[PDB]
Design a protein around this ligand. Structure first.
Ligand SMILES: CO[C@@H]1O[C@H](CS[C@@H]2O[C@H](CO)[C@@H](O)[C@H](O)[C@H]2O)[C@@H](O)[C@H](O)[C@H]1O
Length: 606
């Protein structure tokens, strides 16, 4: 067929489905099971990747080649792994995945965008699409081709430690925010069939709609727990955004740790094969969560043989093992050899994995583009993040009484002003979870601008800016301040350590706001992943802003505080009066909010 050593799957001009079928028909059982296996970079070596024909690698939260690694160091790491995979008999490139869920957030110097709850406050799907585009560039800067995003959970209880990863308690808002997908992957062609995977090429990444399904409905917002709701609530609240994801060509879907009415999602054939594959016609690949199959049993991992059987028969295609690959491969091999898992199931899994890889151009561009390194933290992306942060802010109060002068916007020229609070000069706190570390961290963990730095960058040069983290009342009264900006709120968290029943911010928080506001007119900036008990903060404050977790570009906060733009954000969640009310969502029969979903005050630019 020309060059005599012609191999159809290697021909870039051939249709994807032919390339897939041509490759699949050549593969051994070991090569097939290998494609279905995703491992952590922490256990990967060239020999492991080669000898086990490994299909994929990931960096989990915080899994980095080293602290402060450059874009090029990431590229070299990924390429080293890819070289080993390309040296197998069939030379099937690996796909490398990472949680780039608010920017390329594990990476030092990556732009950090606001978390999803704040993006929901913007009501601006095109903004989120643009965030997707920028995020894909920054992911490709590091040589990575696959992002485990978007999280399209509809969080129904803010006690959930991942509520900040949900755009909204209202599925319509979540559905509208699925525009992240064509940002990350590229717009699908005009003629596109819903459920087909799509990635436009080497400047884009495969996306992942997660976590399927009902991750946001767990009782008491307990992470990984039980979502007790009838089919109708599943289909009406938790499912719809997956259909929007299908229409936009999402390449992969990650299964939830959670259960739906006591059936583990990782073992749910009816939902994974019956509904996702056979009803929504999803033709991308279905990936497990991290040791998701282990958790089918209790205790987790107590019958790994059953875990493999149940998950693979339920219809999962790729397993995020991610560490005990040897055990996973041996066990699945055993099951296929003994007829417990038919070859048709293996071939369906591999067909889907290969379809994604071919479609996205991975066999044509398996290695990183060094020219992309400078997309990491690129200033235009930071300007986009700054826009997003600003648009995410919800003004909850702007004057203590209806006849008070509105405090916001503040004047940039004043003799002396105070910036205070535990969150005023702490980049880690303003980024929250999934930033550098899995759980986030405190202090200056990456490149960005804190609220304090933003204030100093914004004000007139005659304005004296004083910083005090936790000043007492006397310091404030004696200071001669025109006003104060005080930033407090939640510490960084994720899943189970964010699962919180009381939702009160840590002290000193309230006490600092009271000391400051008691001495001078104050704007309180609340940094949180979710609504928290706010009445005491409200009572003390002249103005109060819910800034959510705005990311690396704190100038977004000051853009609104000083009137360069008007406040436009609107609550994407219900603000409760008391945690005793929860769960309580817009449209419930007994709906008694402190602030209803959609609430937000506005301001004009000055
Ligand atoms: C405690 O172990 C740490 O867990 C985190 C989160 S679990 C799971 O991980 C996936 C891949 O990173 C995410 O896409 C998904 O949303 C999560 O539910 C994991 O990232 C760390 O690798 C792991 O040490």
């Amino acid at each position: 067929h020309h060059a005599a050593d012609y191999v159809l799957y290697k021909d870039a001009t051939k249709p994807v489905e032919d390339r897939v079928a041509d490759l699949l028909g050549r593969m051994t059982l070991a090569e097939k099971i290998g494609q279905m296996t995703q491992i952590e970079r922490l256990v990967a070596t060239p020999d492991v990747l080669r000898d086990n024909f490994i299909g994929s690698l990931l960096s989990g939260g915080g899994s980095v080649p080293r602290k402060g690694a450059t874009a090029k160091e990431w590229q070299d790491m990924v390429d080293g792994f890819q070289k080993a995979c390309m040296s197998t008999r069939l030379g099937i490139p690996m796909i490398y995945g990472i949680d780039a869920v608010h920017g390329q957030n594990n990476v030092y110097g990556a732009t950090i965008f606001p978390h999803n709850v704040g993006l929901g406050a913007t009501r601006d799907p095109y903004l989120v699409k643009r965030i997707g585009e920028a995020t894909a560039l920054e992911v490709r800067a590091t040589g990575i081709q696959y992002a485990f995003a978007p999280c399209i959970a509809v969080c129904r209880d803010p006690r959930w430690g991942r509520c900040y990863e949900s755009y909204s308690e209202d599925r319509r808002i979540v559905q509208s925010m699925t525009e992240l997908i064509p940002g990350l992957q590229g717009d699908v062609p005009k003629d596109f069939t819903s459920g087909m995977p799509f990635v436009a090429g080497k400047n884009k990444v495969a996306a992942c709609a997660k976590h399927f399904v009902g991750d946001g409905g767990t009782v008491d917002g307990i992470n990984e727990n039980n979502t007790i709701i009838n089919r109708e609530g599943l289909m009406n609240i938790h499912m719809p955004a997956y259909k929007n994801a299908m229409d936009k060509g999402v390449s992969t879907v990650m299964i939830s740790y959670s259960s739906w009415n006591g059936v583990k999602m990782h073992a749910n054939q009816d939902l994974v094969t019956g509904y996702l594959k056979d009803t929504l016609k999803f033709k991308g690949f279905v990936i497990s969560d991290y040791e998701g199959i282990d958790r089918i049993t209790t205790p987790a991992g107590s019958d790994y043989s059953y875990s493999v059987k149940a998950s693979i028969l339920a219809g999962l295609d790729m397993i995020m093992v991610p560490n005990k690959y040897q055990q996973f491969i041996s066990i699945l091999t055993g099951h296929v050899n003994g007829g417990v898992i038919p070859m048709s199931r293996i071939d369906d899994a591999v067909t889907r994995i290969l379809r994604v890889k071919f479609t996205m151009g991975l066999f044509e561009n398996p290695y990183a583009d060094p020219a992309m390194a400078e997309q990491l933290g690129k200033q235009e992306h930071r300007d986009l993040a700054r826009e997003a942060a600003r648009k995410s802010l919800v003004l909850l109060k702007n004057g203590k009484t209806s006849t008070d002068a509105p405090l916001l916007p503040l004047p940039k020229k004043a003799p002396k002003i105070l910036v205070a609070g535990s969150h005023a000069d702490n980049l880690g706190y303003q980024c929250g979870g999934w930033t550098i570390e899995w759980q986030g961290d405190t202090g200056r963990t990456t490149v960005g601008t804190t609220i304090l730095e933003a204030v100093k960058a914004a004000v007139d040069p005659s304005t004296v800016v004083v910083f005090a983290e936790n000043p007492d009342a006397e310091f404030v009264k004696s200071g001669g301040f025109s006003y104060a900006i005080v930033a407090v709120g939640e510490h960084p968290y994720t899943e189970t350590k964010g699962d919180n029943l009381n939702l009160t911010i840590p002290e000193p928080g309230l006490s600092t706001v009271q000391a400051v506001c008691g001495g001078v007119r104050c704007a309180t900036v609340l940094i949180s992943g979710r609504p928290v008990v706010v009445q005491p903060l409200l009572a003390a404050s002249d103005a109060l802003v819910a800034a959510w977790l705005p990311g690396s570009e704190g100038q977004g906060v000051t853009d609104a505080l000083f009137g360069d733009f008007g406040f436009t954000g609107r609550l994407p969640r219900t603000w409760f009066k008391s945690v005793d009310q929860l769960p309580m969502n817009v449209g419930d029969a007994h709906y008694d909010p402190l602030f209803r979903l959609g609430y937000g005050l506005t301001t004009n630019a000055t």
